[PDB]
Design an enzyme around this catalytic site. Sequence first.
Site, PDB file in Angstrom:
ATOM      1  N   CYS A  79      -9.146  -3.880  -3.245  1.00 22.31           N
ATOM      2  CA  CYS A  79      -7.816  -3.474  -3.681  1.00 22.31           C
ATOM      3  C   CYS A  79      -6.982  -3.173  -2.463  1.00 22.31           C
ATOM      4  O   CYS A  79      -7.472  -2.634  -1.486  1.00 22.31           O
ATOM      5  CB  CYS A  79      -7.947  -2.209  -4.544  1.00 22.31           C
ATOM      6  SG  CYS A  79      -6.411  -1.594  -5.271  1.00 22.31           S
TER       7      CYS A  79
ATOM      8  N   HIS B  63       0.829  -1.205   0.000  1.00 28.32           N
ATOM      9  CA  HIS B  63       0.000   0.000   0.000  1.00 28.32           C
ATOM     10  C   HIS B  63       0.866   1.259   0.000  1.00 28.32           C
ATOM     11  O   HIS B  63       0.636   2.169  -0.773  1.00 28.32           O
ATOM     12  CB  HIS B  63      -0.916  -0.061   1.232  1.00 28.32           C
ATOM     13  CG  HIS B  63      -1.817   1.110   1.403  1.00 28.32           C
ATOM     14  ND1 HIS B  63      -3.121   1.124   0.971  1.00 28.32           N
ATOM     15  CD2 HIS B  63      -1.598   2.316   1.977  1.00 28.32           C
ATOM     16  CE1 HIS B  63      -3.664   2.296   1.262  1.00 28.32           C
ATOM     17  NE2 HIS B  63      -2.762   3.042   1.870  1.00 28.32           N
ATOM     18  N   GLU B  64       1.839   1.334   0.906  1.00 26.97           N
ATOM     19  CA  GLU B  64       2.679   2.525   0.972  1.00 26.97           C
ATOM     20  C   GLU B  64       3.500   2.716  -0.310  1.00 26.97           C
ATOM     21  O   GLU B  64       3.644   3.832  -0.813  1.00 26.97           O
ATOM     22  CB  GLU B  64       3.600   2.507   2.195  1.00 26.97           C
ATOM     23  CG  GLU B  64       2.906   2.461   3.536  1.00 26.97           C
ATOM     24  CD  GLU B  64       1.925   3.604   3.810  1.00 26.97           C
ATOM     25  OE1 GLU B  64       1.872   4.593   3.058  1.00 26.97           O
ATOM     26  OE2 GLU B  64       1.197   3.520   4.839  1.00 26.97           O
TER      27      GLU B  64
ATOM     28  N   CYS C  66      -5.659  -0.017 -10.607  1.00 26.65           N
ATOM     29  CA  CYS C  66      -4.400   0.374  -9.988  1.00 26.65           C
ATOM     30  C   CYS C  66      -3.219  -0.327 -10.647  1.00 26.65           C
ATOM     31  O   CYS C  66      -2.163   0.273 -10.834  1.00 26.65           O
ATOM     32  CB  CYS C  66      -4.435   0.079  -8.488  1.00 26.65           C
ATOM     33  SG  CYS C  66      -5.578   1.164  -7.577  1.00 26.65           S
TER      34      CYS C  66
ATOM     35  N   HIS D   3       1.371   4.156  -2.958  1.00 24.69           N
ATOM     36  CA  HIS D   3       1.301   5.613  -2.839  1.00 24.69           C
ATOM     37  C   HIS D   3       2.545   6.279  -3.434  1.00 24.69           C
ATOM     38  O   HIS D   3       2.444   7.288  -4.118  1.00 24.69           O
ATOM     39  CB  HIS D   3       1.215   6.048  -1.375  1.00 24.69           C
ATOM     40  CG  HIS D   3      -0.127   5.918  -0.715  1.00 24.69           C
ATOM     41  ND1 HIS D   3      -1.298   6.366  -1.277  1.00 24.69           N
ATOM     42  CD2 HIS D   3      -0.465   5.445   0.506  1.00 24.69           C
ATOM     43  CE1 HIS D   3      -2.303   6.159  -0.438  1.00 24.69           C
ATOM     44  NE2 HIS D   3      -1.818   5.627   0.669  1.00 24.69           N
TER      45      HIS D   3
ATOM     46  N   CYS E 150      -8.257   3.756  -3.181  1.00 27.72           N
ATOM     47  CA  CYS E 150      -9.070   3.117  -4.198  1.00 27.72           C
ATOM     48  C   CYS E 150     -10.316   2.588  -3.516  1.00 27.72           C
ATOM     49  O   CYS E 150     -10.253   2.184  -2.357  1.00 27.72           O
ATOM     50  CB  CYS E 150      -8.261   1.961  -4.798  1.00 27.72           C
ATOM     51  SG  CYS E 150      -9.098   1.061  -6.097  1.00 27.72           S
TER      52      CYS E 150
HETATM   53 ZN   LIG Z   1      -7.314  -0.190  -6.871  1.00 25.33          ZN
HETATM   54 ZN   LIG Z   2      -2.930   5.060   2.433  1.00 23.67          ZN
END
Ligand SMILES: [Zn+2]
Ligand SMILES: [Zn+2]
Length: 163
Positions: A135, A120-121, A157, A124, A131
């Site tokens: 996801c 996740h990071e 994504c 980013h 999202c």
């Molecule tokens: Zn997504």
């Molecule tokens: Zn976040």
Amino acid sequence: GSHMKIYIQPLSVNSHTVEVLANSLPKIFNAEVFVLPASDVSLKCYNASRRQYNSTCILRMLPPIKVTLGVTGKDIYAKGMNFVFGEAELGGARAVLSVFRLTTADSELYRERVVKEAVHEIGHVLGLKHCSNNCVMRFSNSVQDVDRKPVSFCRECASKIRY
Ligand SMILES: [Zn+2]
Ligand SMILES: [Zn+2]
């Protein structure tokens, strides 16, 4: 050919946790992953009143080399939050993850949570916003959130990463 680079900076965290990420992130991001020598998370980022480290402070101490992920076992927070799992420069170079709030006696689940939050990071950092699909880029502020989202990027994504 060319590949994304991910540098993992251990900051007061166990080696096991680092190795989970070293072995999972290459395939997820099609990345050259490098584990940097361990160091202590900086005392300059310790908030004595909260007894926590500040995520923004930690992030900004990392070298700005895309992509560098600091990983700590200490509890972190950011402005306006009781705690955070991490923080990232959106579209930048640096991020930080803390595994403190992810700990669990379910060892397999712990690993899954660590990978999810790292992914996740890094997402980013690669420019992905939160999202609404099923996801890994779904927002997470509690571990229940983390457990209920998948580790994979949705097709939208994944496209934004690849193209
Ligand atoms: Zn997504
Ligand atoms: Zn976040």
